[PDB]
Every structure is written in C-alpha cells, then in structure tokens.
Design a protein around this ligand. Structure first.
Ligand SMILES: *[C@@H]1O[C@H](CO[C@H]2O[C@@H](C)[C@@H](O)[C@@H](O)[C@@H]2O)[C@@H](O[C@@H]2O[C@H](CO)[C@@H](O)[C@H](O)[C@H]2NC(C)=O)[C@H](O)[C@H]1NC(C)=O
Ligand SMILES: *[C@@H]1O[C@H](CO[C@H]2O[C@@H](C)[C@@H](O)[C@@H](O)[C@@H]2O)[C@@H](O[C@@H]2O[C@H](CO)[C@@H](O)[C@H](O)[C@H]2NC(C)=O)[C@H](O)[C@H]1NC(C)=O
Ligand SMILES: *[C@@H]1O[C@H](CO[C@H]2O[C@@H](C)[C@@H](O)[C@@H](O)[C@@H]2O)[C@@H](O)[C@H](O)[C@H]1NC(C)=O
Ligand SMILES: *[C@@H]1O[C@H](CO)[C@@H](O)[C@H](O)[C@H]1NC(C)=O
Ligand SMILES: *[C@@H]1O[C@H](CO)[C@@H](O)[C@H](O)[C@H]1NC(C)=O
Ligand SMILES: *[C@@H]1O[C@H](CO)[C@@H](O)[C@H](O)[C@H]1NC(C)=O
Ligand SMILES: [Cl-]
Ligand SMILES: [Cl-]
Ligand code: NA
Length: 527
C-alpha cells in the first residue's frame, strides 16, 4: 500500500509488475480546479486541496474532442482515439515511479500530439511504466484542453484570452516543481518530451518566460512551433471566434456577451461547429491553436527564435522518414489505405489543391516543378511518392531542421535524428512507409515486452533509443556508451550532422533534405 503526501493532499497509487520488477503508478491526480461553468475558456485555476486519500488508481476523463470516424473498426486510426470518457472535467496527470522509490530521480514529462484539437495521456503508446522500470526515471504526463475549449481567442480579454491549453501544461509543470520530490523525483532535472502538436508545445515552452524555470531540457519529436500549422495569427483567431459565435447563434456586439453566451452552449454544440469556423480546411487544419497572446507568448515566435530570445539549454530534435503519407488518405483523390494508391499527374495536381487551399496557382505550379523532375525510370509510383514528400517536407521536416539550425546558432548543443524503421506490426499499408507517429512506441519501450510480437531486431532498437533518451534527460548527451554504438555528434549550422535510427547500423549523415528545404524555407514563404 503506497500513500504519498502532496501539498494538496494524500494520494494512493497501485503496484504493477513489469519485467519481473515493480513500478508504482499514480493515474489521474488532479492538478487544477475543473474548468467548468464560469471557468470555461479561462486560464486554469490552482488546486484547492482535499483531505482523506485521493485514489489515483485509474486514468481520468479525457478532454472534450471530436473523434476520428474515417475507418471504424481499423486499429491504425482507432488506436489514436480517446480511451476514457470525455468531459470538461479533464485536468489530471499521471506519475510512474520505480520501486523501490528512487532517491532523486530524473523526470520525463510527456506532452501528447493531436493537432491541438485531440489527444489524451492514457493511450497505450504513452504508457510510462516501461521507462520507469528500465531506466529508473520518473515519467509524468498530463491532460490539457484542446479545440475551442482550449484555444478559443478574443485577444486581450481574460474571459477568453487564448492559449489556455498551453497554460494547463504550464500549471502541470508547476505541480511537478512543487510536488515531485515527495515521489522521489529531482525537480532540478526535468525533461519535457512530445510528438507533433506536443513537440510544438515543448518548443513554445522554450520561448515562454513563465515556463523558463519549470524544466531543464527538451525533446522534440516531429514538430516545432515554426511548422506552418502551429500558430494562429491574431486576425484568423478573431475571425474564427466570431465565426463560431455566428454558427452557434451567439453573435453579440459586446464581446464579453459572446463569451457569456458560448459558456451556455453545451460541449457537443461547440465541437460540432469547430470544423466550419474556416472556409476551406485540409487534413492538417488546426482550427483553434496557439496565438500570440501577450502572456504565454510575448511576440511573434519567428522573431524570438531569430533574435535569440529563448531558454538556453540542450535540445534533441527528430523526424520520421515518411511523415506526410498518413494525411493523404484523408482527402487526396486516388489515395486509399486499401490499395497501392498509384495516382496520375492530374490527381497529384488535385492533391495540391487539397493541401494548399490557396496559395496562388503560381504557388502550386512551383511545388510541382520542384517535386516532379523525375530521374527517372517512370516509375508508376512517382507521383504517389512525390505527394507524401511534399506534405512531409513542408509540414514537419524542413520546419524541424530550421528550428534546429537557428536554436543551435546561439551556442547550445543540439542533436538531430532521422527515424527510418517501419514497425513489423504496422496496420497501415506498405506504401505508407515509416509513418508519422510510429516512433513513439519505440521511445516508450513497448517492443521490450517480448510477449508482444515485435521482432528481436526491434527489441534491440527500442532498448537503444530508450537509453539514448534517458541519457539525454539525465546528462544532456544522447549516447549509448556501452555497446560500442555510433556516437551521436552535435548538430551545428554549417555541417548539419544527424543520426539515423534503424535496426541495422545507424549512420552519421549531413544536410538532410538540403535541396527540398531550400525550396520551402527560402522561396515558398514568398508566394
Ligand atoms: C472570415 O470568415 C468569413 C465568414 O465566412 C464564413 O461564415 C462562417 C460563419 C462559417 O460558416 C464559414 O464556413 C463561412 O465561410 C469568411 O468569408 C467567406 O470567404 C469565402 C472565400 O472568400 C467566400 O466565398 C464567402 O462568401 C465568405 N463568407 C461570407 C459569409 O462572407 C472569410 O474568408 C474569413 N476570413 C478569414 C480566413 O479570416
Ligand atoms: C484505390 O482506391 C481508391 C479509393 O476509392 C475506392 O477504394 C477502393 C478500395 C474501393 O472500395 C472503391 O470502390 C472505392 O471507391 C480509388 O479511388 C477512387 O477511384 C474510383 C475509380 O472507380 C473513383 O470512381 C473514385 O472517385 C476514387 N475515389 C477517391 C476518393 O479517390 C483508386 O482508383 C484505387 N486505385 C487503384 C486500384 O490503384
Ligand atoms: C538532488 O540533486 C540536486 C541537484 O542535481 C541537479 O542540479 C541541477 C542544477 C542540474 O545539475 C541537474 O542536472 C542535477 O542533477 C541537489 O541539489 C538536491 O539537493 C538533491 N536532492 C536529494 C538527493 O535529496
Ligand atoms: C480508495 O481506495 C481503496 C481501495 O482498496 C479503498 O479501500 C478506499 O475506501 C477508497 N476510497 C474511495 C473509494 O473513495
Ligand atoms: C460589455 O459587457 C460587460 C459584461 O457585463 C461589461 O462589464 C462591459 O463594461 C461592457 N463593455 C462595454 C464597454 O460595452
Ligand atoms: C547492450 O547490449 C546487450 C547485449 O550484448 C543488451 O542485452 C543490453 O541491453 C544493451 N544495452 C543497451 C543500453 O542497449
Ligand atoms: Cl500539365
Ligand atoms: Cl550502433
Ligand atoms: Na520559383
């Protein structure tokens, strides 16, 4: 029986057997007042405090969110859907600690992705019990508000200031600072890690003055705030907020009246209108996201990054070989998870209209010119392959490389990886390759469970990743020092060395996607 005394009360956890050892789990500890009623759309309020023992013995509710219904019955998509009841009462976190209680362990805090519109900490691929068991770190993860309920913005108005879901994250980080020594953790050794929107979040915590002293280091998996989907301008934000008002019959003249109205709508009415606050969207739409609010974010973040105004510390950044393939079966003509999706020059053109709503015609011709100089066979899968690369390079890979260059130009060590292993258990078709999201299970150590039908080469790959991530968090250096592994060099502007992660041998390469990113990074933002 394990009871830990926290500043807000006592909590009881539960013991789990993992690989012939024990980890203790505290699932669903609250970290804020439930944001209901008049608290809807507001910054999270700190926690009142209970007496008696809070039982943290199951995962809490997930925050309200629309769900992916494109492939009912399909594990590939359904594995990302929420697996606890949805509810506005969702502000909870989880802690996993090694047994016996460690003495001053390093802390890993996970922030989930989901486009800022979806996600939850209780997914199976985010289970922190392997990391605690194997590397004797503490793992924490939190639920934060997503969609309008987490990011609705009427700039300058504390009834709806914007960025509320980012303040949920921040307050969870504060909870770790005040409470983690009680569970055996070292608050002076805290690493944030995250994927996609969760990576983008990690990168804004690097820019946010209020987050500066709540963590030590940061890991960014497939995402950063300079991605084109990650930050909403103040103009779009207001247009979207009134557009949602209009659609829910909440249009008013006094802005506090709109918010007051919207606080009487009920969750399903808000969720149901989120998709249309925008004339045209794409499979990568972030209708309600981070904004420059003058509080969490004090200036456009491209300016902060260029001019060196962020937390000085080490970073670990990466991307997957086929980032862009997942999104093509959500609306590109000729694509299906149920066939090899050979498409034609003209389907490719239509595909760009889907992914670049506009985007002048010259904008779109220039993408085509740059990605369709075949060399050459012909090669029926030429156009199918080119559309995934377009989507991956633009949305994930070039933005992560550019964040990494600029961050490192200010004097800090940075490490970059390119993950190129396709899970032997991937339920999506072969043509989709090393998809977005499918490194996560390796980072969390799921392939360490033999019972689970991964190959031997995959167990070893996972074991090596887990060690590198842990060494990064503990010591600031992602090396695996014992099994004569390849050294991971720091990434600098100039040489730009990166490390490949795959089940054969890993290599040091230079200048990932050099020609492609010159296009996205120098030219395209002009059109
Ligand atoms: C700001 O919003 C307007 C409003 O248009 C929207 O009305 C909302 C309530 C919502 O239902 C949404 O689906 C609808 O489009 C946008 O204006 C629209 O823009 C398109 C393309 O230019 C026009 O064809 C429409 O006529 C026009 N609608 C109206 C009613 O004027 C506008 O684009 C948007 N501006 C942005 C992007 O900030
Ligand atoms: C690969 O499949 C796509 C997807 O559309 C189809 O999915 C199949 C598995 C099957 O159930 C089919 O009936 C379903 O519509 C095909 O794209 C479609 O191609 C058909 C040609 O009949 C068009 O009529 C559809 O408009 C088009 N749909 C979309 C949304 O793209 C595609 O042709 C097929 N390609 C192959 C076999 O290479
Ligand atoms: C636990 O260690 C504390 C300091 O260790 C951290 O100090 C940071 C500045 C940074 O170097 C981290 O990477 C270090 O790991 C120490 O001050 C505490 O007193 C220790 N607490 C214990 C053991 O009770
Ligand atoms: C907390 O959990 C334990 C389960 O054994 C129980 O004994 C205790 O009464 C619980 N309190 C509740 C259910 O609120
Ligand atoms: C709008 O209504 C709010 C809410 O009662 C009120 O406090 C505010 O003064 C009004 N704003 C103006 C200046 O019209
Ligand atoms: C090192 O290699 C051995 C096999 O010789 C393996 O079992 C062990 O887990 C490896 N350690 C890491 C951190 O990869
Ligand atoms: Cl043509
Ligand atoms: Cl190696
Ligand atoms: Na050009």
């Amino acid at each position: 029986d394990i009871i830990i005394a926290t500043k807000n009360g006592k909590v009881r956890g539960m013991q789990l057997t993992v690989f012939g050892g024990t980890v203790t789990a505290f699932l669903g500890i609250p970290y804020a007042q439930p944001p209901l009623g008049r608290l809807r759309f507001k910054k999270p309020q700190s926690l009142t405090k209970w007496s008696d023992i809070w039982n943290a013995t199951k995962y809490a509710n997930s925050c309200c969110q629309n769900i992916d219904q494109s492939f009912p019955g399909f594990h590939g998509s359904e594995m990302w859907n929420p697996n606890t009841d949805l509810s506005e009462d969702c502000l909870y976190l989880n802690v996993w600690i090694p047994a016996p209680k460690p003495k001053n362990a390093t802390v890993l805090i996970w922030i989930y992705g989901g486009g800022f519109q979806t996600g939850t900490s209780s997914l199976h691929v985010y289970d922190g019990k392997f990391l605690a068991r194997v590397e004797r770190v503490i793992v924490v993860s939190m639920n934060y508000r997503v969609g309008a309920l987490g990011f609705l913005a009427l700039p300058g108005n504390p009834e709806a200031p914007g960025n509320m879901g980012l303040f949920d994250q921040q307050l969870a980080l504060q909870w770790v600072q005040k409470n983690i020594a009680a569970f055996g953790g070292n608050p002076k050794s805290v690493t944030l890690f995250g994927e996609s929107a969760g990576a983008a979040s990690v990168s804004l915590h690097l820019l946010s003055p209020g987050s500066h002293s709540l963590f030590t280091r940061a890991i960014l998996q497939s995402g950063s705030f300079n991605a084109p989907w990650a930050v909403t301008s103040l103009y779009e934000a207001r247009n979207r907020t009134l557009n949602l008002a209009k659609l829910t019959g909440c249009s008013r003249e006094n802005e506090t009246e709109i918010i007051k109205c919207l606080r009487n709508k009920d969750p399903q009415e808000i969720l149901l209108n989120e998709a249309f606050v925008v004339p045209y969207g794409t499979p990568l739409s972030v209708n309600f996201g981070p904004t420059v609010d003058g509080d969490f974010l004090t200036d456009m973040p491209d300016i902060l990054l260029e001019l060196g105004q962020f937390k000085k510390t080490q970073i670990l950044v990466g991307v997957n070989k086929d980032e862009g393939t997942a999104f093509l079966v959500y609306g590109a003509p000729g694509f299906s998870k149920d066939n090899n999706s050979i498409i034609t020059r003209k389907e490719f053109q239509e595909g760009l209209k889907i992914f670049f709503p506009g985007v002048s015609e010259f904008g779109k011709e220039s993408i085509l010119f740059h990605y369709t100089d075949w060399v050459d066979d012909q090669r029926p899968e030429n156009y199918r392959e080119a559309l995934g690369d377009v989507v991956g390079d633009y949305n994930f890979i070039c933005p992560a490389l550019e964040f990494t260059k600029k961050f490192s130009e200010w004097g800090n060590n940075a490490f970059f990886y390119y993950f190129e292993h396709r899970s032997s258990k991937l339920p999506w078709p072969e043509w989709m390759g090393v998809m977005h999201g499918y490194e996560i299970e390796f980072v969390f150590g799921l392939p360490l469970e033999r019972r689970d039908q991964y190959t031997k080469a995959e167990e070893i790959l996972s074991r090596s990743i887990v060690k590198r991530w842990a060494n990064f968090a503990k010591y600031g250096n992602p090396q695996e020092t014992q099994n004569q592994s390849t050294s991971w060099p720091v990434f600098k502007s100039t040489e730009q060395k990166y490390l490949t992660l795959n089940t054969e041998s890993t290599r040091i390469m230079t200048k990932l996607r050099a020609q492609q990113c010159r296009f996205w990074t120098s030219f395209f933002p002009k059109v």
